[model samples]
Target: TDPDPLQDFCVADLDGKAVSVNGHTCKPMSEAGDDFLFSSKLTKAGNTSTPNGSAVTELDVAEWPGTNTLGVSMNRVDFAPGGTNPPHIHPRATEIGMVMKGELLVGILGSLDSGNKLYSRVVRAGETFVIPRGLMHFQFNVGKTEAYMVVSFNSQNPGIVFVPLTLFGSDPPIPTPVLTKALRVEAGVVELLKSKFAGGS
Candidate 1:
């Protein structure tokens, strides 16, 4: 979770400077009018046509500056039938998400300090799930129809790390030799995975 807000009203001043604080520069109150209001974006399903068949639309500080210093943010995810969001983690905050349509399988991996168990469930529309901060987790659409989910976090910028992408699909990828050694796989196998994830974020 992020630090508590210092005031009742504040919005990010993107071009302003917060050179010394742990938080962002604030936009002036009068100038911040309507800045906090939002969005037709979250109303419709995002593009979920990729191989993973999921699209996550985030409303973090970067996408919604009004969230700056507010200590909260959100994201909406849409999935095609049988699609997966993939294994991932929120490094900055915990999550509480609710399924809005179809059925989903939510899995949260426990930490080594906590016996390293995998906690999971089949969640339906109106059902909710939680993810511990910094722990690996994932969601998969399991129903015949498409899936929809909305999530909230305790931090304005809930940092994300998609495990597979971080490991095999980073823009400046982890070295193939390192990957092969880490996964105990052949160089050819590592190459194959890298090829599939080239130019990933």
Candidate 2:
């Protein structure tokens, strides 16, 4: 969760070319304009031409400077038929997603103190689901048609961690023995996974 804002707003000065506490510094008041009042990006469809058949359009403070210090942001996701958005974590915020079209199977893992309980369901157009802060979650399009969803977060910057790539494709790469032991698998299996996701995404 984000700290409450002390002022009316801190519209980000994206061109400020640097970052600071409480999100980016505010643009000079005179420089702020009607531009902060609207966004049209999500009105159009996003491209989902990746190998995984999914694409995401983010709307954080970085993309819409007005969201700075507002402690909120959104994402538009599109999936080709039968596509899946792989498991991932958001360290800074909780997420709420709503299906806009088609159907999806959403799943989330609970807090460790809860024995990592699983919460999952199949949702259709107009249905919504929530993922607790810092929890791992995923969504898969299970309908015959392409799917679309919009996800909102409680923080302007919800920072993502893609689990598979994070473990197998770190910059320096995790040591092979460490992976083998942690996963309880043979070195060959680790190697094979490394081969598939060794480079940064």
Candidate 3:
């Protein structure tokens, strides 16, 4: 989690000086207005027509400056039937999410060195799940209709790392040989996976 707020709020001044001791330059109170009062983007689902048939829309300090220094943020995840959100981790905060529609199979994988225990469940609307910070987790739409969830985090900037994309789609690219060796697969297999995520964020 980020440091505690020094005051009631510090709406981010994105265009202000680049340097800040606590991760953001404050927007003056006088400048704050109705813009800081509402966010409507999360009301609709994100595009879920990608290869994974899933999409995520984030509402962090970067997207809604009013959330800066408030130590909280949110995300709206949409998924088509059989779609997967993919394995990922939030480095800076724990996550609490609630299924808003349809059913989803959520899986949280425990640390391998300690013991590879997996906590998984099929959750429906109104059900909730939690993921420990830095743990690998994923959500899959298991119902026929589309599914969605609203997830909240403890940090305004909860860092995310999608496993497949990070390993195979990085800019400048991770060497094919390095990937093949690590996965004990042929170079062709590594290349195939890399192609899928190429140019993707």
Candidate 4:
């Protein structure tokens, strides 16, 4: 387990300024040393060495209950051969990932800046990549051996949208017509998912 450092006391910004909403204000830009975030002494726990070739475990707000205000959370992911983190987007935060070991093929969905590129870049170990806020992104271990990476968010409380939970978790049960209309899928298919996960109407 990782030792809880941000527990018991508060951390001030540089120059020892008090903490505030949003985040710590600009202190001396460095009340401490090192511009990089420190990694917790956590080793990989769950392992999936089957077909997909990857396994993952989360270490974020869920792990650190102390993360009430600091607008950022982190997750540790490990990839095996042919392992790929599927495409997904944080509803509110910009995701920055650092490859701890091996190579990664990274890409993002959604429109890039007016003059920026999208879905481009294959980063290697010791390298980092970013997916602008609200943009869908994915990563795959395209190397020979397994790979590992850390994903950091720019929001303290990030929202995860699971396809089934989103569609079937709604009360009053989202009508099959609504799903069909929105997703362009057949009403019968929508009902099938609803019946399988959530008792259908």
- Residue 187, model 4: lDDT of 77
Colliding pairs, model 3: none
lDDT of each: 0.87, 0.88, 0.90, 0.64
lDDT of 2: 0.88
lDDT digits (tens) for residues 1-201 of candidate 4: 122344433233433445644433333423534522444634763475733455656655445433434566777788886787766567877778888888889987656454434565778889988887777667778888878888887775456543444576467677778889988889788877777656421
> Residue 65 of candidate 1: its Cα lDDT?
78
Could you tell me the TM-score of candidate 1?
A: 0.92
Candidate that would win on lDDT: 3
lDDT of 2 by residue, 1-201 (tens): 787887886788876556666567888768887779579879977888875678989898889888888889999999999888889999999999899999899999988798999888999989989998999999888899999999999999999898888899988889999999999999999999999885566
Candidate 3: list runs displaced more than 4 Å. Answer: 16-22
lDDT (Cα, 0-100) at 69 in candidate 2: 80
Q: Against the true structure, what is each candidate's TM-score? A: 0.92, 0.94, 0.94, 0.60
Residue 20, model 3: Cα distance from true site in angstroms: 5.1
| Residue 46 lDDT in candidate 4 | 49
lDDT per residue (tens digit) for residues 45-135 in model 1: 8999987899999988877877877788999999999999999989899999999999999999989888989999999989999887899
Per-residue alpha-carbon lDDT of candidate 3 for residues 131-176, written as tens digits (9 for 90 to 100): 9999999999989999999999999999999998899998778999
Ordered list by lDDT, greatest first: 3, 2, 1, 4
| Candidate 1 colliding pairs | none
Worst 10 residues of 1 by lDDT: 14-23
